[PDB]
Design a protein around this ligand. Structure first.
Ligand SMILES: CCCCCCCCCCCC(=O)OC[C@H](COP(=O)(O)OCC[N+](C)(C)C)OC(=O)CCCCCCCCCCC
Ligand SMILES: CCCCCCCCCCCC(=O)OC[C@H](COP(=O)(O)OCC[N+](C)(C)C)OC(=O)CCCCCCCCCCC
Ligand SMILES: CCCCCCCCCCCC(=O)OC[C@H](COP(=O)(O)OCC[N+](C)(C)C)OC(=O)CCCCCCCCCCC
Ligand SMILES: CCCCCCCCCCCC(=O)OC[C@H](COP(=O)(O)OCC[N+](C)(C)C)OC(=O)CCCCCCCCCCC
Ligand SMILES: CCCCCCCCCCCC(=O)OC[C@H](COP(=O)(O)OCC[N+](C)(C)C)OC(=O)CCCCCCCCCCC
Ligand SMILES: CCCCCCCCCCCC(=O)OC[C@H](COP(=O)(O)OCC[N+](C)(C)C)OC(=O)CCCCCCCCCCC
Ligand SMILES: CCCCCCCCCCCC(=O)OC[C@H](COP(=O)(O)OCC[N+](C)(C)C)OC(=O)CCCCCCCCCCC
Ligand SMILES: CCCCCCCCCCCC(=O)OC[C@H](COP(=O)(O)OCC[N+](C)(C)C)OC(=O)CCCCCCCCCCC
Ligand SMILES: CCCCCCCCCCCC(=O)OC[C@H](COP(=O)(O)OCC[N+](C)(C)C)OC(=O)CCCCCCCCCCC
Ligand SMILES: CCCCCCCCCCCC(=O)OC[C@H](COP(=O)(O)OCC[N+](C)(C)C)OC(=O)CCCCCCCCCCC
Ligand SMILES: [Cl-]
Ligand SMILES: [Cl-]
Ligand SMILES: [Cl-]
Ligand SMILES: [Cl-]
Ligand SMILES: [Cl-]
Ligand SMILES: [Cl-]
Ligand SMILES: [Cl-]
Ligand code: NA
Ligand code: NA
Ligand code: NA
Ligand code: NA
Ligand code: NA
Ligand code: NA
Lengths: 311, 311, 311, 311, 311
């Protein structure tokens, strides 16, 4: 079967729509999400026109093999979508209404700069390649673009699902390609990060600072080194959940900065001990008293500077 | 093949039933479960009616290709169910009795608030889309809804498998959809959490409190910081098994609260030492004696408050 | 094709056999194992009978599509078995000899109570559903039930592969079902658990008890808390390899009991220190001397009690 | 299509060959490897014979459906091989030359006794089942057995790929089976184990022995217990990479033996302290001086004994 | 269908091109990457030639079954590529222009020597096997070799995608094979390794060196042993992300070298203590003062030596 012939020199318009049924498995590391949706296609094929009196039916149902169907593909998928045709309906003028239900693993990059307070725009790019006989162009039928109310993405808030109505038409290997951009806007549910990572990490840091109210070097060494180890554990935990980014993330910056605080606390604890042994505890006392104020103040100001730079 | 024609303007009733054979792989993180069941479908097709006297046979068996079969789909599945038709039987009045055996990975959200003392209602939504010639409506045939006695879900108690008999009929892309809700009620087997997480976690906490019967700062620092590290290990273990929720879970609340107890024990241990060095051990002794009662009492009361808020 | 017609009102006997070729991937957590075997089926179809003199041939070979083959399914599989027909041979009396080679992921529960000294009975349930024309019943041909000598299940000793010759005939959705139970008896190779978990766990426990030959509280605290942490690591390791059971396992019981020993050693270490500070080292010395005998004796007796209850 | 008929009572010889293209994913735990290779089959079918003069062609090309092809299977595969026929060529005498390219996950057991200085013989068993009309026997065409030069198995040195030319002919379910053994000999690249596990493990052990040059019990306890914990980490790491064996592995033996050294160092550290407190430091000094020589000497000799028993 | 017949004794040239659409999942451990691309094939088939005047059409479109298509395969793939034909266009001279969209998991070895500052050349080898009638040779059409601008490989910078225009023609099982090498040059994004592994590792090492400004053996032992344990954690982390190489990697060398520094710091800390106890603190003081300079100087020089040898 060949494509529909034109009335003039006009391209064939395939009206599209995606209606999300299921949204799942947003893998932060892989920068992928799985979708289960309806793909709706509509175009005119005057060769399929018919008389309702003669045929008996007001609308004819065809099997995909029986008629010409445009080869619509997803750009940013891992493998070809698993699709099952739901219906193909032809009206007397030859207007075809195609519907399939598909599932696909979409590959859409994520911006981790503001993690875990980041928002993303996930993309689903629809594409059609023009044939030699006719040029095929994609369109968005907004009445056929939407999402189910129950659509839930674990750890994410689904904001909107809209399509950029004007396709990106371009040449690829001496043939026209019509590409549509469906955008799923989401924002991360940061809640859990507060009791699971952020607050535990702050508590261990604050525990290290109790060494500023102790003259016991042996005890101080234990306090700062132990909490440092707990921080390393949280750092490894965070980096196992996130991909390796060529930029600094907000959590990354905070986690890294905290190492410097542990490093300087070790210096302070060492300096204080050196002085006590050198029979200069008056000088050591001045440093320890200053550290009690300096450490929380510098920590608070640095965090303000970071939150400012990132948000 | 086209759908059965109506006597009046009545919709076509497809009587349904799901009989669970196998229930497995309830992934808490993915909020998915795998099912292996029988799907039973039954509708009247007057075109398939026959006289038992003339034909000789009491029932006719057809192959799926030979007759019209409604396109029944599951809403909350990852991919289309893997199905194998078991039997298609037509009675003289044209009543078709379809049976298939399927397997599918169902995506049904879980409420982790009361974890590990939580119960869930897993859902399996059946759906049919109406055609242009006729409107299709789903029904529940309760004699064909059930589960095998051997049906076991590791770490879960299967309470009931029932269907909400009245379908949710609604319009989707200018066509009627008939959706049925099959509910599998389960309750978690909390037993293992007691010796594996809860009691180990309480033991390490109680070990930290022995610092209230010690004047040795160096030993105290070791007791409280080491047990804190063991608690961090249990916290990381628990959060690796559970998904990130936008709410607090019972275990989450307890685990988080315990951090505060470690933080205050570090303060007490620091205060006691500071006073001893300041030659005020009488004041330190009052605080340490109070802490011996205060810590277990506040721990017990806080836990009562939490259990109350959560149950 | 319809099933063979009966001579009287007798059911159709499908003689079965499973010959295991490959046994692999016994997942303790998933309670699943993968199998690769031969499935042999044999039944009489009088319609396929022939005279060896007239036809010339002693046996006729058919393609699965040409003749009626009973729809034999596995009950306890994740998905339908991947099968490939090897041969279909018809004898002059119409006796069909079917052979296929299949692979399937079998879901059979495990009893972890005696772990890692546990034995299991893995099941492979064969099933046939009766048709309206005839009732189908399964039988075991013991000459066609067996296993390859090379059949190895990593970390398990394959004891026997036998079938319960009398099928469990029952009604399911107003039709007769004939179910056969093939049992694969295995026993765990406990060897590795001794040098990898059991002995390391005992060594760390015995190291904690050296605190009974030390008056140094700071050193004692280090001994008991450090070894406790190593025990936690072994506990987490064991619980990551096993599923969550609503009962206590042997290893689980031992691991849990050892926590109590660590808890009481911390109490002893605390009591001894408190007394030394209170200028009562004579009383402390009595307790420490008693603990040296009490701890190993109570440990040995408790273990005897546990091994008794579990075996 | 039926198999070729015999001239006498001779069996049909199917000449085989496997040419490895790709070798990957040798899973030590699963005892599996993935292969991508050419399978070549050759047999005489007199029915396909032709005169090159009359026909004009020197060779005829057939599609698999057109002619009889022997059902060749792999014994030790998880699932049936994914195969794609490359060519089927018939010579005038009726000699068929079949070639397919396949990929399969082969299940071949590993001997971990000498790990990580072990060598393995991976097997690929080819098999053919005899039909009722004729008995089929396999043969090895050595000009069609080989491997690509680029064939690389990460962390392994591919030594040889050869076939045991004489098949193992035997009866299975009253039919002859012809089994061929293709052996892929490999040897592990032990290099990485030296800087990643072996040397780190020895360094931590040697650090524990510095306690023999210290009278500080508190410091000694820290040295021996901390290094013991690092050893536990390496033990867990090693056992996560290897399967549970019913025998001792070389690395397993060394790792286990080292626990005894830590246990005896704790005893020495305890004994030395007990004596110092008992005002017998002269006796303690003799034991500590002896331990300085005894520990490395016994460690060296024990290792010689182990290497001897294992190699 | 047979291949095109030659004009002389010339081989058939199949002009090829790969246009990368999607690049993902570069597994460092597996040494694999997944690709989604266009495969373009072009060859002359004189049998398909037509007159544009007589036929009316400028180009004829065929279905893959209708015409002869060369069996083009990928050498270094796990399984056969998942492919979907996009278009087949024949020009009047019989020039066929084939286009398919495929996805494949490519197995291409990586050189980890300079990790994480390494660059790789990923390969995609195209291959065609010659038939008996004609010899098939591959060519590169450079106008049909390229990549999408959006092509992103997480943690990698895509440098170039080019083809080695001259194929590697060779004999394999007495038939000519024409192999083309498509090279995708990439370079790792080392950024993240600096704050995640490199700097944390240096900080813990520098913390160990504060023991050179302490006379407290107990505190020193804690400093050096604790930081050593944190280093072990980073070593295990790094080796879990990388495959086992028969050579030293840059990171591997640095990580290993740092163990020696910890070992020598333990010796220094032990020597200093031994001397203090022997009433020789003057000699101990000389060693500790030297170590303060020696350790950073030897560390800096050793690192210069390593960076030199590796880059
Ligand atoms: C007054 C002392 C200040 C010390 C500042 C240390 C700066 C280190 C910069 C690292 C850059 C990367 C190498 C680790 C050395 C730790 C410092 C020891 C301090 C001893 C104090 C003695 C008091 C007289
Ligand atoms: C040390 C601890 C550092 C914690 C940083 C606070 C969070 C923050 O600063 O987060 C920033 C986010 C921003 O959300 P946004 O809508 O994307 O802002 C976009 C605003 N523009 C468009 C102007 C740039 O605010 C929150 O979610 C607030 C609630 C989180 C509080 C957590 C407290 C612990
Ligand atoms: C009487 C002293 C009370 C101390 C209470 C500390 C409140 C900390 C609030 C944290 C909120 C998040 C920053 C960590 C400082 C630790 C406190 C050190 C106490 C020293 C006691 C000295 C006795 C005279
Ligand atoms: C610190 C330690 C905290 C432990 C909390 C106790 C458990 C609890 O409070 O659990 C609560 C569950 C509730 O079960 P439910 O049927 O869902 O109650 C629903 C009741 N409504 C409908 C009225 C809200 O009770 C149990 O399972 C009791 C047995 C567990 C004991 C574990 C002891 C350790
Ligand atoms: C004679 C003292 C016996 C102590 C027994 C403690 C029983 C704890 C039961 C826990 C049940 C769950 C809460 C932790 C307190 C630790 C006990 C401190 C002992 C101090 C000894 C003082 C010596 C006079
Ligand atoms: C603390 C350490 C506790 C170790 C417990 C010993 C093992 C045990 O008691 O194991 C019990 C198993 C039982 O094997 P069974 O055949 O199933 O007994 C069934 C007997 N009935 C039918 C009478 C109930 O004996 C063994 O495998 C013995 C060898 C293991 C020795 C490990 C020593 C370390
Ligand atoms: C001279 C004392 C030798 C000690 C030998 C210990 C053998 C342990 C065998 C374990 C077998 C399983 C139970 C742990 C006890 C540790 C030993 C404490 C030694 C105290 C020394 C006192 C010096 C007079
Ligand atoms: C404590 C540390 C123990 C380290 C044991 C040394 C290795 C060993 O003994 O390894 C043994 C392997 C054997 O290789 P094979 O060819 O299989 O010997 C087969 C010989 N027969 C046939 C005679 C039995 O030798 C090597 O690979 C040597 C290089 C490794 C050196 C690692 C040093 C660290
Ligand atoms: C002057 C003493 C130098 C010590 C050098 C140690 C070399 C170790 C070589 C290991 C090779 C692998 C076995 C561990 C022993 C640690 C050394 C203890 C030093 C004690 C110093 C006493 C001062 C008189
Ligand atoms: C102890 C810490 C050791 C850190 C080693 C520094 C990195 C290095 O030396 O890295 C080397 C890479 C080389 O990149 P290249 O283009 O492949 O050089 C090829 C050059 N030839 C062709 C001459 C051989 O330089 C970088 O990426 C520089 C930036 C990284 C700085 C990280 C600082 C921390
Ligand atoms: Cl697609
Ligand atoms: Cl479905
Ligand atoms: Cl099955
Ligand atoms: Cl196979
Ligand atoms: Cl391929
Ligand atoms: Cl050659
Ligand atoms: Cl050739
Ligand atoms: Na079509
Ligand atoms: Na149908
Ligand atoms: Na059949
Ligand atoms: Na065939
Ligand atoms: Na073709
Ligand atoms: Na310590």
């Amino acid at each position: 079967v060949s494509p529909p012939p034109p009335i003039a020199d006009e391209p064939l318009t395939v009206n599209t729509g995606i209606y999300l049924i299921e949204c799942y498995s947003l893998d932060d590391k892989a920068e992928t999400f799985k979708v289960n949706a309806f793909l709706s296609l509509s175009w005119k094929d005057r060769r399929l026109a018919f008389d309702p009196v003669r045929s008996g039916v007001r609308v004819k149902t065809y099997e995909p093999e029986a008629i010409w169907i445009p080869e619509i593909r997803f750009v940013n998928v891992e493998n070809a979508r698993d699709a099952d045709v739901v219906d193909i309906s032809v009206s007397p003028d030859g207007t075809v209404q195609y519907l399939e239900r598909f599932s696909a693993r979409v590959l859409s990059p994520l911006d981790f700069r503001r993690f875990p307070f980041d928002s993303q725009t996930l993309h689903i790019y629809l594409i059609v390649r023009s044939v030699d006989t006719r040029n095929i162009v994609l369109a968005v039928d907004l009445e056929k673009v939407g999402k189910n109310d129950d659509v839930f993405l674990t750890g994410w808030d689904i904001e909107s699902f809209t399509a950029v109505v004007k396709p990106a038409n371009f040449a690829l290997e001496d043939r026209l390609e019509s590409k549509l951009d469906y955008q799923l806007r989401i924002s991360r549910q940061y809640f859990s990060y507060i009791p699971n990572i952020i607050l535990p990490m702050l508590f261990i840091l604050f525990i290290s600072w109790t060494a500023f109210w102790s003259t016991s070097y042996e005890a101080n060494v234990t306090l700062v080194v132990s909490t440092l180890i707990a921080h390393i554990a949280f750092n490894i935990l965070v980096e196992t959940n996130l991909p390796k980014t060529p930029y600094m993330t907000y959590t990354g910056a905070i986690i890294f900065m905290i190492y410097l605080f542990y490093f300087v606390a070790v210096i302070e604890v060492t300096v204080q001990h050196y002085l006590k042994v050198e029979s200069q505890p008056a000088r050591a006392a001045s440093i320890t008293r200053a550290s009690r104020i300096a450490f929380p103040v510098v920590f608070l100001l640095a965090n303000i500077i970071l939150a400012f730079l990132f948000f």
